[PDB]
Design a binder for these strands. Structure first.
Lengths: 56, 180, 129, 141, 262, 124
RNA sequence: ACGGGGAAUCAGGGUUCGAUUCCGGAGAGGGAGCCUGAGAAACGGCUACCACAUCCAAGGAAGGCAGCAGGCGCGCAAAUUACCCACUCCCGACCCGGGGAGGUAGUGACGAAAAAUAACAAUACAGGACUCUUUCGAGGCCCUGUAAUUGGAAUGAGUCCACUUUAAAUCCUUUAACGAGGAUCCAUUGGAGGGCAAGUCUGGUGCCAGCAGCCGCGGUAAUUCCAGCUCCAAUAGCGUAUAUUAAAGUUGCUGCAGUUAAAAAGCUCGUAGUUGGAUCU
């Protein structure tokens, strides 16, 4: 039961900085963006039911 | 001993199942249609409608010629007709159970401001109300959830101190005209 | 031993209706059994019946129209107030359109609709639908 | 079968009251023996002093070494082994310091592959383990 | 515990004072007097909450200490003085007189009376006893002891006394057909004609009363206060004549009044 | 842009020798108008000097159009000094409160409690 | 375990809770005994003993915050040694005095209500929308938006003025002067295998570190760990630990079960208990 290895993986993981991005809207505007993307935009869906984060 | 009052009441109820697709899609449809801020406004209108339906049901269980049923049923029907969610022609307890959540969301000041042409969109209506550009009768109303009555429907004006219905230019216009 | 002859009568009627028979023989008869059968028959559920008189305790032959789904007794006979009647109908009846709870009230033995018409609560005898 | 009589209320009540003692949750919550055996004594959290660091081996189907600390509670002096949740978080804990320890989420039951451990460390040296983990706060000097 | 209490919590006060809960912790604890704590009206409540002549209790104190208020013809400087049923309140400076009469909702109405009617009041007698060398006595609901009463006056009858002299002027017997008022319970404030009395020895009697519009109600005998002989009252009744309206007719009248008046 | 002063309720209170009213103030584009201006307007309206008029409790409605408050018009200045609260008189400048504090008075009283005789008047 | 009014889901029925502002009771460190008084076995009264504890010149003297504040201690666990009698009332010999009752207050996310963090282009675009004559072509008619080229209008967060408010005051409200283009005036908390909404994308790690309420993931191509990006759930709020309710028809009165899953006593009498046939106009 050696405690020598503790935080080894969090220690040896390469440190990648967070990229600077445009701030996201909040409140009613974020909900409006969600509603427009999911119910007003019909182009992406031809009827195959793909997930919003499908990267394949 | 204090001279205060602790009578408070939560105005909504959280759904039993946090993640079900049909409810999420329907509530997002409602938010997008009526320009609401979060799911809590949908749940608040849902809670109002559910309380109304519960009262109507408990009245409908009573005797038809029951004095309490008659009195409270007429009171509830008058309250629903007054805000314009129920037609005056169909004023019976059984027509209450036919009401939907959208009948109540149509009576918000946001919806009435967008529908009367005072705003370009429902979100423009919300920001117009929140920015003190709208008055109902002679009173400036600042709450988008203001449930407009039937008698105050024709009195939603564009205020008198706002540049849109008043005539004093705002901060930005004054500053930019001052740079001419 | 045999207690609650009404329970036996109603169980026999129910069992004979399940089997698809046209007549059922009920014994022993009683005043409450006759009143329950009369309430059933006024509503068209059971049709005519005949009381056989043996000199000790009658038997009843009941014609059976195929209209009856279930007749049951409630034991013990709970005292039911007019404000608790709706809960009993929700517990016992298939819907609010058909089905009756038979109460015994000081105004006699009748169904729950009549008991509400006469503004009487009583003791629950049974139900039929 | 059960008794159905207008005067059977006492029998039904007494039978229900006697049969409730055959319910595990009811007996646990009303006998009071599980309360005296609880190191927290009915409390949600407790403060203890870290006696040593220990690594407990995971249960058989999977292999790992779980970084725990043996702590002694201040209220009653009882000895407790508490899991230090995240990685590297055992390095945030020093021997002989105060830690706030909560339950593991199963109401006195062992959680996951950690054997015989039902407590976890929440704060060490009056700063939360999450603030130390995320770098929002540093260990006091 | 340990002797009498001197405070009254505002929420423990009688509900017919129509006090609100956010004003303060306390209600004016009515002082001891001719009327009970739960069925009286403190002078401060009448002068401030009802008549709105004062905004605070200090202004009520100023009004009362200016010796402007007369209850039953006597100047009363106590602002928590318990004024009760049939008590006459006369304010000479403003030249108005009030009689404390229950309205049909069980609350003391602001009932203005003429100065001629402010010279007497009706008192229900509570007991008749003989004492001190065979001298008959008479105790009223007003805690007044009147010596040498008429031998025909018995318990539960109401006498009429002149306030200036404090002597019995007339009396009404307790009998069927006589008009009465209910001074306690669910039917408190209602006016009707006594139709039947049921006697229950060792317990409370029950008196049955019928309104002018034929509504029949009942209450205990202690709650009955006969107003006049027959169906006519000896005192002036409030705006409502003792008729209790059901909520349906109340709403109908309110809606009709809203429609007619603009 | 002209301030309008109205009086919703009105009662002649001969018991306290005053006229009580609720006051409506119309200042659509102005701030909450000062009590001195309201007193001047009420003096002009009710034909009396403004030093017998005491106004208080002015709350401006949301939006900024109307302000509602209460007002008294006493028969004479003497009756005003007799019947008004001391703080309203101080607002008009007719009264001045003690410059001491509750702590100081309480401690002085408790120190006085520790001595007997004329010596009580020798502490502070 | 102070009792009750009452509080936490609504199928119906229930299960828990109620130290806590209202009512009743009790107690003033623990017991006990009293004086005065209408009323006390009173403790911001007294007299003892017990346990603590203050000053002392060592002879003696003085104590009782489970009142308001504040300390220490205990702890997972709880605020200022503030202002005032202006309100509500109470007390007094009293219209006048007093009240840490009570009312009012710069860091209270217990909890509850309302409610910002944005609203409107020419433009290329993947588009579609009333007979589109053309896959090479009117798409501010209706809408979405990769945007290192745009534009004016709106407003409150904030800072300040006017003392509205109030017992001097802060706060909300009101009016003025500044106050928005990464409107940097920059929303977070937990997740992305399933239960359960949302990536078998990339890098590192290689049964280690760790994750994981449960099933499981990790043993060099990890959908689960450590991270980047992207995605979604609620949102000024989210996570966690406990107690508790529903889910639990897994305590079943409604309404469970007992051949083999846990289960009917080896058998039979038997008192209490529970239940008890027809029949009276």
């Amino acid at each position: 039961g050696s405690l020598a290895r503790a935080g080894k993986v969090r220690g040896q993981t390469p440190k990648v900085a967070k990229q600077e991005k445009k701030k996201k809207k909040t409140g009613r505007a974020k909900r409006r963006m969600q509603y427009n993307r999911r119910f007003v935009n019909v182009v992406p869906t031809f009827g195959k039911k793909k997930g919003p984060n499908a990267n394949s | 001993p204090v001279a205060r009052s602790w009578v408070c009441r939560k105005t909504y109820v959280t759904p039993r199942r946090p993640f079900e697709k049909s409810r999420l899609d329907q509530e997002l449809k409602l938010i997008g249609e009526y320009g609401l801020r979060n799911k809590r406004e949908v749940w608040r209108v849902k809670f109002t409608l559910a309380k109304i339906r519960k009262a109507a049901r408990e009245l409908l269980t009573l005797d038809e010629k029951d004095p309490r049923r008659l009195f409270e049923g007429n009171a509830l029907l008058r309250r629903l007709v007054r805000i314009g969610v129920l037609d005056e022609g169909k004023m019976k307890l059984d027509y209450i159970l036919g009401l939907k959540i959208e009948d109540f969301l149509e009576r918000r000041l946001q919806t009435q401001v967008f529908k009367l042409g005072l705003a370009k969109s429902i979100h423009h209506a919300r920001v117009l109300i929140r920015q003190r550009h709208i008055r109902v009768r002679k009173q400036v109303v600042n709450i988008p959830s203001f449930i407009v009555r039937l008698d105050s429907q024709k009195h939603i004006d564009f205020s008198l101190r706002s540049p849109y219905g008043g005539g004093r230019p705002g901060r930005v216009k004054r500053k930019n005209a001052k740079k001419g | 031993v045999r207690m609650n002859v009404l329970a036996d009568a109603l169980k026999s009627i129910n069992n004979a209706e399940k089997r698809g028979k046209r007549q059922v023989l009920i014994r022993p008869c009683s005043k409450v059994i006759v009143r329950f059968l009369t309430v059933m028959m006024k509503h068209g559920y059971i049709g005519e019946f005949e009381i056989i008189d043996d000199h000790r305790a009658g038997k009843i032959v009941v014609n059976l129209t195929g209209r009856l789904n279930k007749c049951g007794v409630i034991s013990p006979r709970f005292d039911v107030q007019l404000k608790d009647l709706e809960k009993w109908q929700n517990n016992l009846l298939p819907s609010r359109q058909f089905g009756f709870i038979v109460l015994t009230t000081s105004a006699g033995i009748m169904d729950h609709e009549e008991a509400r018409r006469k503004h009487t609560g009583g003791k629950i005898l049974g139900f039929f639908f | 079968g059960k008794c159905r009589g207008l005067r059977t209320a006492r029998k039904l009540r007494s039978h229900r009251r006697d049969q409730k003692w055959h319910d595990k949750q009811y007996k646990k919550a009303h006998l009071g023996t599980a309360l005296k055996a609880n190191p927290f004594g009915g409390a949600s959290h407790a403060k203890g002093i870290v006696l040593e660091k220990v690594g407990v081996e995971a249960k058989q189907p999977n292999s790992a070494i779980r970084k725990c600390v043996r702590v002694q509670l201040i209220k009653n002096g009882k000895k407790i082994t508490a899991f230090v949740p995240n990685d590297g978080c055992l390095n945030f804990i020093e021997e002989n310091d105060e830690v706030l320890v909560a339950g593991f989420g199963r109401k006195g039951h062992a959680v996951g592959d950690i054997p015989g451990v039902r407590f976890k460390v929440v704060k060490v040296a009056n700063v939360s383990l999450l603030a130390l983990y995320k770098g929002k706060k540093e260990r006091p000097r | 515990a340990r002797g009498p209490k001197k405070h009254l919590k505002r929420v423990a006060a009688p509900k017919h004072w129509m006090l609100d809960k956010l004003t303060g912790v306390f209600a004016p604890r009515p002082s001891t007097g001719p009327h009970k704590l739960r069925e009286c009206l403190p002078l401060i409540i009448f002068l401030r909450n009802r008549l709105k002549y004062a905004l605070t209790g200090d202004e009520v104190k100023k009004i009362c200490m200016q010796r402007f208020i007369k209850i039953d013809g006597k100047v009363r400087t106590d602002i928590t003085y318990p004024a009760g049923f049939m008590d006459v309140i006369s304010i000479d400076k403003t030249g108005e007189n009030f009689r404390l009469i229950y309205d049909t909702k069980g609350r003391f109405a602001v009932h203005r009376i003429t100065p001629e009617e402010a010279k007497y009041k009706l008192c229900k007698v509570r007991k008749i006893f003989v004492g001190t060398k065979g001298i008959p006595h008479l105790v009223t609901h007003d805690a007044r002891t009147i010596r040498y009463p008429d031998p025909l006056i018995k318990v539960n009858d109401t006498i009429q006394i002149d306030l200036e002299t404090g002597k019995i002027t007339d009396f009404i017997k307790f009998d069927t057909g006589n008009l009465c008022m209910v001074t306690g319970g669910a039917n408190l404030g209602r006016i009707g004609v006594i139709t039947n009395r049921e006697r229950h020895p060792g317990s409370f009697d029950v008196v049955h009363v019928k309104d002018a519009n034929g509504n029949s109600f009942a209450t205990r005998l202690s709650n009955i206060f006969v107003i006049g002989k027959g169906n006519k009252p000896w005192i002036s009744l409030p705006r409502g004549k003792g008729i209790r309206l059901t909520i349906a007719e109340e709403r109908d009248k309110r809606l009709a009044a809203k429609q007619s008046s603009g | 842009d002209t301030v309008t002063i109205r009086t919703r309720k009105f009662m002649t209170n001969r018991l306290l020798q005053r006229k009580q009213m609720v006051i409506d103030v119309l200042h659509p584009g102005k701030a909450t108008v000062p009590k001195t201006e309201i007193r001047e307007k009420l003096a002009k309206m009710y034909k009396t000097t403004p030093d017998v008029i005491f106004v208080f409790g002015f709350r401006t409605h949301f939006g900024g159009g109307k302000t509602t408050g209460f007002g008294m018009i006493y028969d004479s200045l003497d009756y005003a000094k007799k019947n008004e609260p001391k703080h309203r008189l101080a607002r008009h400048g007719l009264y001045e409160k003690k410059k001491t504090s509750r702590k100081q008075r309480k401690e002085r009283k408790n120190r006085m409690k520790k001595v007997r005789g004329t010596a009580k008047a020798n502490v502070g």
